[PDB]
């Protein structure tokens, strides 16, 4: 069994003094790490909202997560959407405007969390136009929350559904 733990990184809030363009228990953004022979390694990032943990399926792979002294366990997942919810139903209903700029709360493995302001690229799909946020970040950054101007989570770094 892989020893997967989550650790709180910071609060999830829109950053007003944020850098624009592209230079590339408790609510918040968590690092997802598993204990190794050398040490822990960061494999993903998750969003804690309303007592439910949200992360990418590929990061967790369905494995049980250790938070504090309690084991937090999966409730729902979608492999096609690469989404997994722990302890409760998916709580992230936020949608992108399609026109407004967004901030990515990044969590490079081994790096302070930072908010980066960028405009997502818009591409058509059979299921309706989608926004793509692609930057030069490590893999372990996967699951990093994408927030709108209201500070709601509109996407996970990996894919930004827009509703208008
Ligand atoms: N690992 C990155 C990744 C990115 C997007 C998707 C993805 N692929 C296909 C797809 O089809 C749209 C369906 C929606 C339900 N009707 C059937 C078509 N969707 C996605 C996707 C969309 C949104 C999100 C998402 C991220 N945060 N919140 C939702 C993740 C994956 C899968 C992996």
Topology, please?
Layout: E1 4-10, E2 28-35, E3 40-49, E4 52-55, H1 57-60, E5 65-67, E6 70-72, E7 74-78, E8 83-86, E9 102-106, E10 114-118, E11 121-123, E12 130-132, E13 145-147, E14 153-156, E15 160-161
Detailed description of the structure:
The chain has 164 residues and is mainly beta. The protein has one domain (1-164). The protein contains 1 helix and 15 strands. The protein has one helix spanning 57-60, and strands spanning 4-10, 28-35, 40-49, 52-55, 65-67, 70-72, 74-78, 83-86, 102-106, 114-118, 121-123, 130-132, 145-147, 153-156, 160-161. Strand 7 (74-78) and strand 8 form a beta hairpin. The radius of gyration is 15 Å and the shape is globular. Residues 58, 80-83, 92, 127, 155-156, 158-159, 161 line the site of ligand JVM. Residues 58, 80-83, 92, 127, 155-156, 158-159, 161 line the site of the ligand NCc1ccc(-c2ncc(OCC3CCNCC3)nc2-c2ccc(-c3cn[nH]c3)cc2)cc1.
């Amino acid at each position: 069994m892989a020893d997967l733990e989550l650790e709180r990184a910071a609060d999830v809030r829109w950053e007003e003094q944020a850098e624009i363009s592209g230079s590339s228990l408790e609510d918040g953004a968590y690092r997802i790490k598993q204990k190794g022979i050398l040490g822990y390694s960061q494999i993903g990032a998750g969003v804690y909202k309303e007592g439910t943990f949200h992360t990418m399926w590929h990061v967790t792979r369905g494995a049980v997560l250790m938070h504090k002294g309690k084991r937090i366990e999966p409730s729902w997942a979608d492999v096609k959407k690469d989404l997994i919810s722990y302890g409760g139903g998916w709580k992230l209903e936020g949608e992108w405007k399609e026109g407004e700029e967004v901030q990515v709360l990044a969590l490079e493995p081994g790096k302070n969390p930072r908010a980066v302001q960028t405009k997502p690229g818009l591409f058509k799909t059979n299921t309706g136009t989608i926004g793509a946020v692609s930057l030069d970040f490590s893999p372990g950054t996967s699951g990093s929350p994408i927030v709108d101007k209201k500070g709601k989570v509109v996407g996970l770094y990996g894919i930004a559904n827009t509703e208008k």
